[PDB]
């Protein structure tokens, strides 16, 4: 089996992508977050506490006749960026581009913190990273992916995120027509539950490439590209204007600036992020004063490929036994 769905920006700066989703029977269509940095498919639902709900689309299970309370078992999840959300848990039928698994572990919330219910356009999330995270207790649960593998014709499935625009992530084959040039594999550590891998460097603009390997995830669940302060502080020395600030929290540049590029390496292949792409947008409304794509991750404690990163590629996640990452041009 394959699916197939397109996913689409929430707002004009791409902070996030949503892809709808079929749950239950009949089927309640969702636009969820589909985030490669965790492991948990959760959901708005009838249970979650009511003044937490504003514009969402919720699930609820009393009319799904697939639906089964999947007795005893809780989840309760906490995000990089400080939110969280936690509830009880149903088992159901769950489609994604026509691909279907049945009997997959939807998490219901009762409980979402503020920055989902202020978010109307995100139904949830599905978790695409590996599921030694999922917080399921007393049973942990399998990702969508996880329990889709074995029906797939090959086990993987792939990102290709567009910018300012819709994009596509597919599931048991990889579109050799999505792509430029060759797709480059490059090892994983399933070591933390991530899809971990290590960079071979970087350079700004058409400045010469440094070779230095910079360990970090593919997470299409986080918007920017987070990597060590010194390679951050070499990209917006070249923007005139550009400075850390404290207050906003981050990197800024004027406005009228024009970004270089950012390239990273895959093995001996290089992907270039364009200028513009990293380009968030005044810090506030009417600022002259802009928000950068890419931002230190010393006090995260881990390097992050976030969309900023992944949208200017055409990206493979491999499931196989071994599993491995894959990113061509496009």
Same mark, same amino acid.
């Given at each position: 089996s394959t699916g197939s769905a397109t996913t689409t920006p929430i707002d004009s700066l791409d902070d996030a992508y949503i892809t709808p989703v079929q749950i239950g029977t009949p089927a309640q269509t969702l636009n969820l977050d589909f985030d490669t940095g965790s492991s948990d498919l959760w959901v708005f639902s009838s249970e979650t506490t009511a003044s937490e709900v504003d514009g969402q689309t919720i699930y609820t299970p009393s009319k799904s006749t697939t639906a089964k309370l999947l007795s005893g078992a809780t989840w309760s999840i906490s995000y990089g960026d400080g939110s969280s959300s936690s509830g009880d848990v149903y088992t159901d039928t769950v489609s994604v581009g026509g691909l279907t698994v049945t009997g997959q572990a939807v998490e219901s919330a009762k409980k979402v913190s503020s920055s989902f219910t202020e978010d109307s356009t995100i139904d949830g999330l599905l978790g695409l990273a590996? *599921?030694?995270?999922?917080?399921?207790?007393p049973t942990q649960q399998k990702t969508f992916f996880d329990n889709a593998k074995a029906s797939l014709d090959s086990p993987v499935f792939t990102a290709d995120l567009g910018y300012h625009a819709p994009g596509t992530y597919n599931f048991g084959f990889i579109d050799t027509t999505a792509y430029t040039g060759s797709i480059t594999y490059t090892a994983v550590s399933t070591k933390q539950g991530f899809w971990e891998w290590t960079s071979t460097g970087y350079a700004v603009g058409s400045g010469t490439f440094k070779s230095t390997s910079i360990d970090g995830i593919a997470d299409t669940g986080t918007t920017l590209l987070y990597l060590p302060a010194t390679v951050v502080s070499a990209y917006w020395?070249?923007? *005139?204007?550009?400075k850390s600030s404290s207050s906003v929290g981050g990197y800024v540049f004027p406005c009228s600036a024009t970004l270089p590029s950012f390239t990273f390496g895959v093995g001996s292949a290089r992907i270039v992020i364009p200028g513009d792409y990293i380009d968030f947008g005044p810090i506030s409304t009417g600022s002259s004063s802009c928000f950068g794509g890419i931002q230190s991750s010393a006090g995260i404690g881990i390097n992050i490929f976030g969309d900023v990163a992944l949208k200017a590629a055409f990206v493979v996640f491999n499931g196989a036994t071994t599993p491995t990452l894959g990113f061509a041009s496009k």
């Open positions: 590996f *599921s030694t995270l999922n917080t399921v207790s020395a070249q923007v *005139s204007g550009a």
